[PDB]
């Protein structure tokens, strides 16, 4: 019905004559006293078609008057000028000749049909030697090579049935005598009982090539062609120029050189010349053909007088400039434009501002297209006087658009969805583009005279979908999680913070009023401290309203916000200080409860609310907004004095030069961090003079502090440099310096302090300007692998799933159950006894309040559906992802998870590899992640909880998701806090509080891993090396053990589960009181144990830690390279072995490079061997003996073998944790449902390990959507088939051979891809996205998913 | 590389086995291949190895070949070529290929020319011997004097006698009476006493002596040789077919055809003897012989076409190719002998010109016309021949060849006369070039020089220069606009004054399919005279009002 | 915004002009040139005085 | 297509305001038509099927 898709083969020397018309015989393009483009040459109108439109050469058939003819007088066609675009020519090659992409194409292709030295196959094609070809009166046999100086007498008794000959002719002749009715069927019986390995690593390339030839229609003669097809002139557009010069460029001149060489080779054979001259001209012809094909690649390039190479045919394809990337997957576009961004604070959220003459330009098709349709001009010709004039009649013609028309807008490079959105015109002055302030955040708009772009949609369908799918009001949220990014923006939120801050004296220390006009009555402030009873409401999930009422302690600005707040959520939410730290969560709560329109209005109307009051804050930066601690004087009498003796201790003989560097840099860090404590008292409270009648020691109104507590743009690392000490820096090598900046920006910077910190600034800004490429190129290659995951289906029957957990690094709660579970789905009937014995069935959509009922029972593991647990062909099933995060709903059938997930990783990686590194002129950290503190009178409610009392003095929590509610005197909750496992409580249940009052604490880098019970310490589900490795210190002798899990283990114990324990006077578990079960305390890796077996301890005492430098949405950080092989999935190229056999270890069978270790089990009778690298460090020699894989050397565990030795859900549970927890340390909480995409698409392939009678082979890794042919007929007709599985092919391998292969050609390494597409004669099915981009179709997502359903009922009729 | 070993071995007349490492081919490693390829190293170079001779040198004189004609003397191309450096240039491979010829100059290539002539001038002696060839030779002229009144046609482009060009018109006409007399006897006295039996051989020999002066233009010569090649293959196709039929029809392989045909070729006599042999194959002929007489009767029908017998074809048409084996070894070997002189001339011009390479290989084809017309019979040397002809074949190889554009050659290299002259301009006026100076340096007006420079640089869109206005395009593909300018002028020139509206259409083609002078127009104007013509111009002075063309001017634009 | 600067005018052609394709011009009106808007002009957005 | 290389598509879509039915009417992405003959000019055969 529609034309389906596309198929491939190669240009057979015969079949070219079904597409072409003769020798393109001569180099020229004109003839002196006649333009008539050369009769028989590069512009041969007899081969390519007419010149001017319809025009043949020599006369009689020109203008639209004549067409469909051939002129007699010079024998030339009469069609149209554009027929020169596809009426192909040819050139008969006077030798069998190569084609570069079958020879220079490593792995290459010609060798895979001959199994003979690829080094020198090229010389046989350069016609340098002979080979035996055919016979039955044989004496020599086939593929025997020769020179030429012997042949003679035997032809009188044998010379009826044998032959041998030279070069390319002999290779192309041998390729006639194979038999595919007998070769391919016999190439497969090794697979019964006997097949080998390196011969398989080579020859399976041939076996796949030959089977692929049989199954696709290919022929081996097409390696060694005898005809060059000729690029149609209109693709290299031959024309003259007004300057008496011609379009002779590159893709014309390369054919002149080939034509000349071939016309010599012809004449030399036509005359039977000296064969020297023929041999040289064959070599020169192949040189010119292969340079015309892919110039440079043949170890040389063809050039012209301005030194440059000429553009090849392959430079339309192979690298960056090729059609795929420059003219198809992106292209130049009409009805468009660009200009400099400008802030538009009176645009409503659905709108954008556009200059009148830009609206005129972008809307010309509506004007030169409606004057002739109303009579509002006499003609389109006369209308030049009226349209360019911007005359009145243009503007009815444009309201008829504007009044309901969605303009599209663009902030390239579009690494993430929100870089493109849709709006509505507003006419303006000027030459700029005016941009609504809430989307300026979603775009990352950077107002240094950078730009945005504009696109007009003109079909009724594009305008329908732009309002429905791309509109700002209709895509508000972060696709990675679901906070708004179309959001109250840069200074808007200082206005909202200012309206929601309060003061002492305050022009109203307690005071109230309505009426903005009372800012003109004499005594008011937005910081004046209102109090009011406000009755307040809260919408239930059923739609009713939970009415409430409360006394408040508030301000005029907090009260004005009850005009703006959607009053179906309660006033008490505004009773705070609405910096960027807080304001998003009001809109988020509205999105969770009320509805879309209410949440849009609440986001939009906050914008102008910010602009009415942001200025009136008077917040600044200035010379006394820069206060300094006086008591810095006393601190300089400590730190510089500590250094002063320590630099003597070196010279008097009590330190070397080296420890002395640390032992002074650490003191410069301690000087900065000492001054940083005094700095905060002076910046935030130091009004000392001694009350009564004095000493307003209030919480400060310093602007630089307010720029950080509003979250407007400030940080502790800015404040240190602006109020106490700039501190320390890196050198260009990255490491710290003994040369501090003890001053700050008000004290000043001397020449040296500037100059040294400028080196760190240069390094950081140069990495900012370069290391983006190490993320953007990777993002481009990622989408080719990621695309096909359109939400197509519903449950996929996959009754299995990943045991996900909160991020509990053994000894922290870095992510609670909520954030990771966020609108995923269960895969088991999960139940945990503890406080409410909750049960959450399989197939339940885990929106947040399912997690609340699980977190009360301190749920720490949940089996869930996964984007990897998804059987669905190309697309995916709704249960595997559950809820979208940007539009915010149960994920729409049509939503493209694939590209969304790639963008959700490529943007934040490339973004923060800039947004942290442009700071390298100074360094510091500061934290508070160690305590919980109450703020008013109330009572304590422990919750989500177990907890115990300790002989060593403590009260301690013993549950993973614990909470500490604060209650009033009557029963109202007033606050709650999450509290780690092992957190020390300073309060009991039902106890009492007043405020200013610490209530829980833990280690600055750890929730201490702590006991319920008292007994001997023990280990379980643990083995030394194979799950844990050792550290040691002195002081008394001391110990610690690093835990190891998924980057670190030997084969013999891969999937162990390390777990500390408490036991009786000899043996086994001191069963956990009130939950009477084993006293065993499971961990991941990267935690560190700090007590051992045979030690004896109490309830509420500690066994393990983490060195957790917490990261966060702050301090900041940045990096990438250690992620790479988690998505390229190899082994380390150095196998620095960790041994697989316990204790008995030696060397004894050494060999001609690598070492050979010799090993035996401790109670066995059976020796084994290991090949340690040639020279590699060993940390052992004779006594240093361990279990199966401690630090004998240091080789980390290969990621591909985490699949091979633990299976798909296990490897997914660590790739979707290590890369995820880099982004969690960046504060970028991406939900796991995104990195599961890259793991699904390494798992794109499916191993097969024998032949059959369906989709089945050995040594193969088929696209999983095909190999399901197994279940599709085994269960219906029985058939015959083999073992099949799933793989971890890296992006550089998984992409090269997709079924959507039209997309894969754009991946780069485009010779490697297109040779496989040629070998497989490949035939697409249009099932990703990029394939329909390339063929200009509706893409198989959303509104074109809604069309692919029709094709799925052509491909299935009956 | 190889040349070192084979050359020093041939200079020595002897090569010891181990000297394969003293004069090593800087190429390859094939140590176990030696024990048979040593064979054709020894039949034309024999030596072996032992402690010491005392009086034993002579061995070569009873055990070796004698001409180095074409064998391991030239097929050694493969064994010197075989290691072209896998990525490195045509400007390397030619150095291995010239591993053949060193410097055969100053008398060796003159001996190649001596051996061209004992080729060509001895093929002449068998043109004089194959009785159809000496017939078609005179048929060349008897085709054209036969029509009672002629002067040119095949009388011109023929006769062409390199009698060291020492003739006149009547001695040129005598070429059709002298040789015709030697022919018309021999033509039938080949049947008197027998084909070459006594004086028939002397008659052939004296016809073959006079024909030594019939040394001719290379294609009038090669027409007669091609005629003898084709008339040989009239028999060789029949042998090639009938030998195949001995296998295919008869089951009687190769040697058994030769055993019976080659002593009574002419007829089914030897085929009926092939039946008479008996044996199961011959026994099968008793019910298929008809299908072989249906082919062998057209070997017989070649003697029946000519008065030949295969007895002549056995030797004469081989004596031809014994002359060709010299003539076309030498017209190959002469090109080979000069392949270095082609580089030293061509490489001058390869100086970025278009490429460092290709002009050498076009010189190697210019060398063909040079080797064909090598008049050493003037006295001069092939060095000077190359300095003229082969140099200008090298010039033209990128003058108009391989360009965008090409012109008659005077109008190509004249553009380069101007660039050659510019070497004064850029230092004598001497700051920038000026065409105004070039006018005195050429003694000519700039525009009649711009005759070339307006179009011969890369050609503006001049459709068929300006003549495209009157060519094949005058069909409705243009003239529909003429039938619009004519309409608009017919409108205005019919609203103008009741008298004046005729005149102001006459002489040049304005309004009628024959835009007449007086007779048919005055008879439609009446009263008076050549106002009939003057009013074609009167319009200049009271049709002065420029609005008078308001409906006329569109026909430059439609 | 659009003024001429240098008069590089160019005539156009359309030419087909048969007895049932002469739709308007070549009989009934605008019987003067069809010059393409090809003269050099001030770009749409530029404004300011000619100085040399 | 209708805002780029497809001459057919862009020349109809521009005028589809005069149809009143402002709709797409594409014909062929010419940058893919180009590629289908550039691939054949290297020597790779490429063609189509129906559904």
Automatic annotation (TrEMBL), chain A:
Gene Ontology MF terms: DNA binding; DNA-directed RNA polymerase activity; magnesium ion binding; zinc ion binding
EC number: 2.7.7.6
Alphabetical list of InterPro entries matching this protein: DNA-dir_RpoC_beta_prime, DNA-dir_RpoC_beta_prime_bact, RNA_pol_asu, RNA_pol_N, RNA_pol_Rpb1_1, RNA_pol_Rpb1_3, RNA_pol_Rpb1_3_sf, RNA_pol_Rpb1_4
GO cellular component: cytosol; DNA-directed RNA polymerase complex
Binding site for Zn(2+) 2: 796, 870, 877, 880
Catalysed reactions listed for this entry: RNA(n) + a ribonucleoside 5'-triphosphate = RNA(n+1) + diphosphate
Positions annotated to bind Zn(2+) 1: 56, 58, 71, 74
CDD domains: RNAP_beta'_C, RNAP_beta'_N
Domain (RNA polymerase N-terminal): residue spans on this chain: 221-500
Cofactors named for this entry: Mg(2+); Zn(2+)
N6-acetyllysine modification, residue list: 965
Keywords assigned: Acetylation, Coiled coil, DNA-directed RNA polymerase, Magnesium, Metal-binding, Nucleotidyltransferase, Transcription, Transferase, Zinc
Tagged with keyword Metal-binding: yes
Residues forming coiled coils: 170-204
GO BP terms, alphabetized: DNA-templated transcription
Family: In the C-terminal section; belongs to the RNA polymerase beta' chain family.
NCBIfam families listed in its UniProt record: rpoC_TIGR
The protein's assembly and partners: The RNAP catalytic core consists of 2 alpha, 1 beta, 1 beta' and 1 omega subunit. When a sigma factor is associated with the core the holoenzyme is formed, which can initiate transcription.
Function: DNA-dependent RNA polymerase catalyzes the transcription of DNA into RNA using the four ribonucleoside triphosphates as substrates.
Name of this chain's protein: DNA-directed RNA polymerase subunit beta'
Species this chain originates from: Escherichia coli
Taxonomic lineage: Bacteria, Pseudomonadati, Pseudomonadota, Gammaproteobacteria, Enterobacterales
Encoding gene, per UniProt annotation: rpoC
């Amino acid at each position: 019905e529609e034309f389906d898709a596309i198929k491939i083969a190669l240009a057979s020397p015969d079949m070219i004559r079904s597409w072409s018309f003769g020798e393109v015989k001569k180099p020229e393009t004109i003839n002196y006293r006649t333009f008539k483009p050369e009769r028989d040459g590069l512009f041969c109108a007899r081969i390519f078609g007419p010149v001017k439109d319809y025009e043949c050469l020599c006369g009689k058939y020109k203008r639209l008057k004549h067409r469909g003819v051939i002129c007699e007088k010079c024998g030339v066609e009469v069609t149209q000028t554009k027929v020169r675009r596809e009426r192909m020519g040819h050139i008969e090659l006077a030798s069998p000749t190569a084609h570069i992409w079958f020879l220079k194409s490593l792995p290459s292709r010609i060798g895979l049909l001959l199994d003979m030295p690829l080094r020198d196959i090229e010389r046989v094609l350069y016609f340098e030697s002979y080979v035996v070809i055919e016979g039955g009166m044989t004496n020599l046999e086939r593929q025997q090579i020769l020179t030429e100086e012997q042949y003679l007498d035997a032809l009188e008794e044998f010379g009826d049935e044998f032959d041998a000959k030279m070069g390319a002719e002999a290779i192309q002749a041998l390729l006639k005598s194979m038999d595919l009715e007998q070769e391919c069927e016999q190439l497969r019986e090794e697979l019964n009982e006997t097949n080998s390995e390196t011969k398989r690593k080579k020859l399976t390339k041939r076996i796949k090539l030959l089977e692929a030839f049989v199954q696709s229609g290919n022929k081996p003669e097409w390696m060694i062609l005898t005809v060059l097809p000729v690029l149609p002139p209109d693709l290299r557009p031959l024309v003259p120029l007004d300057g008496g010069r011609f379009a002779t460029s590159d893709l014309n001149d390369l054919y002149r050189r080939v034509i000349n060489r071939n016309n010599r080779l012809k004449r030399l054979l036509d005359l039977a010349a000296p064969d020297i001259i023929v041999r040289n001209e064959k070599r020169m012809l192949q040189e010119a053909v292969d340079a015309l094909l892919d110039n440079g690649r043949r170890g040389r390039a063809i050039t012209g007088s301005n030194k440059r190479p000429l553009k090849s045919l392959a430079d339309m394809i192979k690298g960056k400039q090729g059609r795929f990337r420059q003219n198809l997957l992106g292209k130049r576009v009409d009805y468009s434009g660009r200009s400099v961004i400008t802030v538009g604070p009176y645009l409503r959220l659905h709108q954008c501002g556009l200059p009148k003459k830009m609206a005129l330009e972008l809307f010309k098709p509506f004007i030169y297209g409606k004057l002739e349709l109303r009579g509002l001009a006499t003609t389109i010709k006369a209308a030049k006087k009226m349209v360019e004039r911007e005359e009145a009649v243009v503007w009815d013609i444009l309201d008829e658009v504007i009044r309901e028309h969605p303009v599209l807008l663009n902030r390239a490079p579009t690494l993430h969805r929100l870089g493109i959105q849709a709006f509505e015109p507003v006419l303006i002055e000027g030459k700029a583009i005016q941009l609504h302030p809430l989307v300026c955040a979603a775009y990352n708009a950077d107002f240094d005279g950078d730009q945005m772009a504009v696109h007009v949609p003109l079909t009724l369908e594009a305008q329908l979908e732009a309002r429905a799918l791309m509109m700002s009001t209709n895509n508000i949220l972060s696709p990675a999680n679901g906070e708004p990014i179309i959001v109250p923006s840069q200074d808007v939120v200082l206005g909202l913070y200012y309206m929601t801050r309060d003061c002492v004296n305050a022009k109203g220390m307690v005071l109230t009023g309505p009426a903005e006009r009372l800012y003109r009555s004499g005594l008011a402030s937005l910081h004046a401290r209102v109090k009011v009873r406000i009755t307040e409401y809260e919408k239930d999930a059923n739609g009713e309203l939970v009415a409430k009422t409360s006394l408040k302690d508030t301000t005029v600005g907090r009260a004005i916000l009850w005009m703006i707040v959607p009053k179906g959520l309660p006033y008490s939410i505004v009773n705070q200080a609405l910096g960027k730290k807080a304001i998003s969560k009001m809109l988020n709560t509205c999105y969770r409860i009320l509805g879309l329109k209410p949440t849009v209005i609440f986001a939009d109307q906050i914008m102008y609310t910010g602009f009415a009051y942001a200025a009136r804050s008077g917040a600044s930066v200035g010379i006394d907004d820069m206060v300094i601690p006086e008591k810095k004087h006393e601190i300089i009498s400590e730190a510089e004095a500590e250094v002063a003796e320590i630099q003597e201790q070196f010279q008097s003989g009590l330190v070397t030069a080296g420890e002395r560097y640390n032992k002074v840099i650490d003191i410069w860090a301690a000087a900065n961090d000492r001054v940083s404590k005094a700095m905060m008292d002076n910046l935030q409270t130091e009004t000392v003079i001694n009350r009564d009648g004095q000493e307003e020691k209030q919480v400060s109104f310093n602007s630089i502090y307010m720029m950080a507590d509003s979250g407007a743009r400030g940080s502790a690392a800015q404040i240190r440099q602006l109020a106490g000490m700039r501190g320390l820096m890196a050198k260009p090598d990255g490491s710290i310096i003994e040369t501090p900046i003890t001053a700050n920006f008000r004290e000043g910077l001397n020449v040296l302090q500037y100059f040294i910190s400028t080196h760190g600034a240069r390094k950081g800004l140069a990495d900012t300007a370069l290391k983006t490429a190490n993320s953007g190129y990777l993002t481009r290659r990622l989408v080719d692998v990621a695309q096909d995951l359109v939400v197509t289906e519903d449950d996929c029957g996959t009754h299995e799933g990943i045991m996900m957990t909160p991020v509990i690094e053994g000894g922290d709660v870095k992510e609670p159950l909520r954030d990771r579970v966020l609108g995923r789905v269960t895969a088991e009937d999960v139940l945990k006894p503890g406080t409410a014995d909750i049960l959450v069935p399989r197939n339940t959509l885990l929106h947040e309040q399912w997690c609340d009922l699980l977190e009360e029972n301190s749920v720490d593991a949940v089996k869930v559906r996964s984007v990897v647990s998804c059987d669905t062909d190309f697309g995916v099933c709704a249960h595997c992802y559950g809820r979208d995060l940007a539009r915010g709903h149960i994920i729409n059938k049509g939503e493209a998870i694939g590209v969304i997930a790639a963008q959700s990783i490529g943007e934040p990686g490339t973004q923060l590899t800039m947004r942290t590194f442009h700071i390298g002129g100074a360094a510091s950290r500061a934290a508070a992640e160690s305590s919980i503190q109450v703020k008013n009178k109330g009572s304590i409610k422990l919750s989500n909880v177990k907890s115990v009392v300790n002989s060593s003095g403590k009260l301690v929590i013993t549950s993973r998701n614990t909470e500490l509610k604060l209650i009033d005197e009557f029963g109202r909750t007033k606050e709650s806090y999450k509290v780690p496992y092992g957190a020390v409580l300073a309060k009991g249940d039902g106890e009492q509080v007043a405020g200013g009052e610490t209530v829980a604490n833990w280690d600055p880098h750890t929730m201490p891993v702590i006991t319920e019970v008292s007994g001997f310490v023990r280990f379980t589900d643990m083995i030394d090396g194979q799950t844990i490795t050792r550290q040691t210190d002195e002081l008394t002798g001391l110990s610690s053990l690093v835990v190891l899990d998924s980057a670190e283990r030997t084969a013999g114990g891969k999937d162990l589960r390390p777990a500390l324990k408490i036991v009786d006077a000899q043996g086994n578990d001191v069963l956990i009181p009130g939950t009477d079960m084993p006293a065993q305390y499971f961990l991941p890796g990267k935690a560190i144990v700090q007590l051992e077996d045979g030690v004896q301890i109490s309830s509420g005492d500690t066994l393990a830690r983490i060195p957790q430098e917490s990261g966060g949405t702050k301090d900041i950080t940045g990096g990438l390279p250690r992620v790479a092989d988690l998505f390229e999935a190899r082994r380390p190229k150095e196998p620095a072995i960790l041994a697989e056999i316990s204790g008995i270890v030696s060397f004894g069978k050494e060999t001609k490079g690598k070492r050979r270790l010799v090993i035996t089990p401790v109670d066995g009778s059976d020796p084994y061997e290991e090949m340690i690298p040639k020279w590699r460090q060993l940390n052992v020699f004779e006594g240093e003996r361990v279990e199966r894989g401690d630090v004998i050397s240091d080789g980390p565990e290969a990621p591909h073998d985490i699949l091979r030795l633990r299976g798909v859900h296990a490897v997914t549970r660590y790739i979707v944790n290590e890369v995820q927890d880099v982004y969690r340390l960046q504060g970028v909480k991406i939900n796991d449902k995104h990195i599961e995409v890259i793991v699904r698409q390494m798992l794109r392939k499916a191993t097969i390990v024998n032949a059959g009678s369906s989709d089945f082979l050995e040594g193969e890794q088929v696209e999983y959507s095909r190999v399901k042919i197994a279940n599709r007929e085994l269960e219906a007709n029985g058939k015959v088939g083999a073992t099949y599985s799933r793989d971890l092919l890296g992006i550089t391998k998984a992409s090269l051979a997709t079924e959507s292969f039209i997309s894969a050609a754009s991946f780069q390494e485009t010779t490697r891809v297109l040779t496989e597409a040629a070998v497989a004669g490949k035939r697409d099915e249009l099932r990703g996205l990029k394939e329909n981009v390339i063929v200009g179709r509706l893409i198989p997502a959303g509104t074109g998913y809604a069309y692919h359903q029709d094709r799925m009922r052509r491909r299935a009729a009956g | 590389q190889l040349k070192l070993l084979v050359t020093r071995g041939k200079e020595q007349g002897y090569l010891t086995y181990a000297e394969v490492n003293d004069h090593l081919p800087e190429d390859i490693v094939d140590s176990d291949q030696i024990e048979d390829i040593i064979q054709m190293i020894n039949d034309m170079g024999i030596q072996v190895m032992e402690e010491a001779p005392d009086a034993d040198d002579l061995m070569l004189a009873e055990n070796t070949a004698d001409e180095d004609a074409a064998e391991a003397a030239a097929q050694v191309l493969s064994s010197v070529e075989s290691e072209i450096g896998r990525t490195t240039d045509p400007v390397r491979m030619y150095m291995r290929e010239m591993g053949t010829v060193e410097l055969l100059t100053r008398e060796g290539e003159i001996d190649i020319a001596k051996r061209i002539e004992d080729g060509i001038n001895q093929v002449q002696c068998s043109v004089a011997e194959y009785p159809e060839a000496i017939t078609y030779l005179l048929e060349q002229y008897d085709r054209v004097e036969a029509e009672e009144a002629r002067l040119s046609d095949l009388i011109t482009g023929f006769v062409d006698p390199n009698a060291e060009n020492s003739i006149d018109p009547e001695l040129a006409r005598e070429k059709f009476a002298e040789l015709r007399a030697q022919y018309v006897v021999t033509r039938d006295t080949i049947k008197a006493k027998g084909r070459s039996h006594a004086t028939a051989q002397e008659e052939i020999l004296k016809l073959s002596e006079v024909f030594k002066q019939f040394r001719l233009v290379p294609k009038q010569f090669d027409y007669l040789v091609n005629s003898m090649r084709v008339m040989m293959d009239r028999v060789r196709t029949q042998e090639r077919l009938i030998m195949k039929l001995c296998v295919e029809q008869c089951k009687m392989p190769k040697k058994n055809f030769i055993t019976l045909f080659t002593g009574n070729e002419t007829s089914d006599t030897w085929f009926n003897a092939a039946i008479a042999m008996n044996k199961p194959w011959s026994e099968k002929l008793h019910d298929v012989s008809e299908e072989v007489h249906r082919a062998l009767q057209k070997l017989q029908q070649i003697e029946e076409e000519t008065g030949l017998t295969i007895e002549q074809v056995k030797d004469i048409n081989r004596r031809m190719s014994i002359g060709e084996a010299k003539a076309r070894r030498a017209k190959k070997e002469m090109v080979e002998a000069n392949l270095r002189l082609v580089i030293s001339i061509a490489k001058k011009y390869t100086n970025r010109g278009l490429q460092f390479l290709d002009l050498i290989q076009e010189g190697n084809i210019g060398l063909m016309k040079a080797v064909d017309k090598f008049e050493y019979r003037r006295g001069y040397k092939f060095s000077t021949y190359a300095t003229w002809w082969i140099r200008q074949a090298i010039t033209r190889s990128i003058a108009d060849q391989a360009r965008t554009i090409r012109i008659p050659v005077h109008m190509i290299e004249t553009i380069n006369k101007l660039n050659r002259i510019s070497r004064q301009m850029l230092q004598e006026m001497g700051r920038e070039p000026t065409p105004e100076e070039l006018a005195e340096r050429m003694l000519m007006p700039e525009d009649k020089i711009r005759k070339v420079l307006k179009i011969s640089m890369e050609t503006p869109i001049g459709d068929d220069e300006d003549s495209h206005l009157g060519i094949d395009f005058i069909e409705d593909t243009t003239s529909a606009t003429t039938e619009s300018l004519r309409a608009a002028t017919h409108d205005v020139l019919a609203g103008l004054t009741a008298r004046e509206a005729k005149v102001l259409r006459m002489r040049f083609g304005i309004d009628m399919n024959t835009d007449y002078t007086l007779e048919e127009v005055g008879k439609q104007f009446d009263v008076t005279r050549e106002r009939i013509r003057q009013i074609e111009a009167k319009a200049l002075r009271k049709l002065r009002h420029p609005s008078r063309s308001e409906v006329l001017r569109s026909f430059l634009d439609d | 915004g659009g003024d001429i600067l240098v008069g590089k005018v160019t005539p156009k052609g359309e030419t087909q002009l048969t007895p049932e394709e002469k739709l308007l011009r070549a009989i009934f009106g605008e019987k003067a040139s069809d010059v393409k808007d090809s003269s050099l002009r001030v770009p749409n957005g530029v404004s300011g005085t000619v100085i040399d | 297509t209708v805002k780029s290389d497809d001459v057919n598509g862009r020349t109809k879509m521009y005028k589809n305001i005069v149809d009143g039915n402002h709709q797409m009417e594409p014909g062929m992405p010419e940058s893919f038509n180009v590629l289908l003959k550039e691939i054949r000019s290297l020597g790779i055969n490429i063609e189509l099927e129906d559904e």
